[PDB]
Amino acid sequence: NLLFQSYLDNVGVQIVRQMRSGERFLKIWSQTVEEIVSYVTVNF
Amino acid sequence: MNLLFQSYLDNVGVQIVRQMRSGERFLKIWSQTVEEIVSYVTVNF
């Protein structure tokens, strides 16, 4: 699924960049989960 | 809902931390994860 795979590749770069700010991984993850659930809402 | 999907993604994040603790770098873990999440949604939705 190219559109979703490319969206998720974008979410990985978002995550890397917030990890480099010193934030705890699971905190970043709980916020980016919302992007993924929203995408699946719209598209599936 | 969709609560089974929320559950699944909560577990993905914990599994990512487990792998980073093992010494794998987030960026190498993530490529595998993207394929897992796309398969989960393709199968379940």
Side-chain angles (χ1 to χ4, degrees):
Chain A
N1 185 316
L2 174 60
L3 189 66
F4 190 28
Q5 183 186 335
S6 53
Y7 184 86
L8 291 165
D9 286 339
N10 189 290
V11 170
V13 176
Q14 297 174 230
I15 289 172
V16 166
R17 284 182 180 183
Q18 299 307 307
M19 294 183 67
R20 290 179 169 160
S21 81
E23 194 59 86
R24 189 172 183 257
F25 178 82
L26 283 175
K27 189 258 221 299
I28 293 161
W29 184 244
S30 67
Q31 300 176 326
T32 54
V33 168
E34 298 283 29
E35 293 181 31
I36 297 173
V37 169
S38 290
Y39 179 100
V40 176
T41 298
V42 171
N43 297 269
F44 295 90
Chain B
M1 229 163 183
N2 145 53
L3 290 177
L4 53 133
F5 189 49
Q6 180 69 49
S7 185
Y8 167 68
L9 296 171
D10 288 344
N11 188 63
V12 170
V14 170
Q15 290 180 328
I16 292 169
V17 181
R18 286 198 178 101
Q19 293 171 262
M20 291 188 312
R21 274 140 124 251
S22 272
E24 191 47 67
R25 216 50 92 70
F26 168 81
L27 250 352
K28 176 140 148 176
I29 291 154
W30 189 249
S31 44
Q32 176 63 58
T33 300
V34 170
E35 189 227 307
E36 288 177 13
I37 293 172
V38 172
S39 291
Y40 181 101
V41 171
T42 294
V43 165
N44 292 133
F45 296 85

